[PDB]
């Protein structure tokens, strides 16, 4: 177990200390003799807890926003979808074969942005905005978020102008 009897263990209750002082000199060299079999502990980075089927559970990443692009140490982008109490379940934008258990995950601080602007006109991109037609990167272009809110009730007018499809059945 109950909470009322477990919250009273924050107080000390030993009245004898023949083991606390014994291992405190003994803890640090016993830790250090497997220091190269350790991994550096992550707080604001993330380490891949598990991976499979395009989903990586990530331990750490204390300050990812929901929907933020995270990057793995292989350069594959992710997107932190469900933040949980003990891990982050991210979705992998590509193959997860290059993502192993123990890989480092780096947040980027950006919610998922795409190239917008006049320069993207006439181009063939993938679902993230990056060009796939093989004629250079998108210039004359600024980034913008993909999860913008729709315009409100007051930000609209009534739909009055016709948009011509050119097909007689729909235009008639």
């Amino acid at each position: 177990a109950d909470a009322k009897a477990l919250d009273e263990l924050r107080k000390p209750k030993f009245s004898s200390k023949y083991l606390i002082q014994h291992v405190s000199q003994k803890l640090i060299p016993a830790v250090k003799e497997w220091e190269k079999s350790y991994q550096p502990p992550v707080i604001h980075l993330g380490r891949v807890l598990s991976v499979g089927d395009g989903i990586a559970r990530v331990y750490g990443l204390k300050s990812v926003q929901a929907g933020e692009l995270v990057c793995f140490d292989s350069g594959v982008k992710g997107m932190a979808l469900n933040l949980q109490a003990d891990h982050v379940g991210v979705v992998v934008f590509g193959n997860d074969s290059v993502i192993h258990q123990g890989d480092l995950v780096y947040r980027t601080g950006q919610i998922v942005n795409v190239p917008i602007g006049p320069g993207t006109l006439g181009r063939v991109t993938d679902g993230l905005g990056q060009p796939i037609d093989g004629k250079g990167p998108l210039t004359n272009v600024r980034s913008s978020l993909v999860e913008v809110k729709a315009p409100g009730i007051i930000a609209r007018q009534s739909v009055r102008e016709p948009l011509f499809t050119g097909v007689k059945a729909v235009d008639a």
Partner: protein
């Protein structure tokens, strides 16, 4: 393709890219809507975007609904499609008009994604397959 953009998240791509490609294309077309020009967007097979989002939700152990679609699969299509708007005169007068494409299964529009997007949008262009081989092309019912 002096005026056409193409956002192409193909079938080989990972399911979050297929889920995210309509939002990328709509954020590209909102440049034209939000700066006084006029936009036109086609989400070819929005019933594959819903499948990709179902895959990501079922692998993230989200609670499924009917046809194993998550609870926010109506919210998924509605928060995308409501960005297709006709802005007022003070916001530039621009507009974005959407043409989502839903593939039904032998005309069964009582399926889940078809009912969701039918309830969301401002009308349908039905294309029955019995009218197609009757010579009527476009097979508009």
């Amino acid at each position: 393709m002096r005026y056409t953009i193409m956002v192409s998240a193909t079938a080989s791509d990972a399911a979050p890219l297929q889920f995210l490609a309509p939002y990328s294309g709509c954020a590209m077309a909102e440049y034209f809507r939000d700066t006084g020009k006029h936009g036109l967007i086609i989400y070819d097979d929005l019933s594959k975007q819903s499948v990709a989002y179902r895959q990501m939700s079922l692998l993230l152990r989200r609670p499924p609904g009917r046809e194993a679609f998550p609870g926010d699969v109506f919210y998924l299509h509605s928060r995308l499609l409501e960005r297709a708007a006709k802005l007022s005169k003070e916001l530039g007068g621009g507009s974005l008009t959407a043409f989502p494409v839903i593939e039904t299964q032998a005309g069964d529009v009582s399926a889940y994604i078809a009912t969701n997007v039918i309830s969301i949008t401002d009308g349908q262009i039905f294309l029955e397959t019995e009218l197609f081989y009757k010579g009527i092309r476009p097979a508009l019912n």
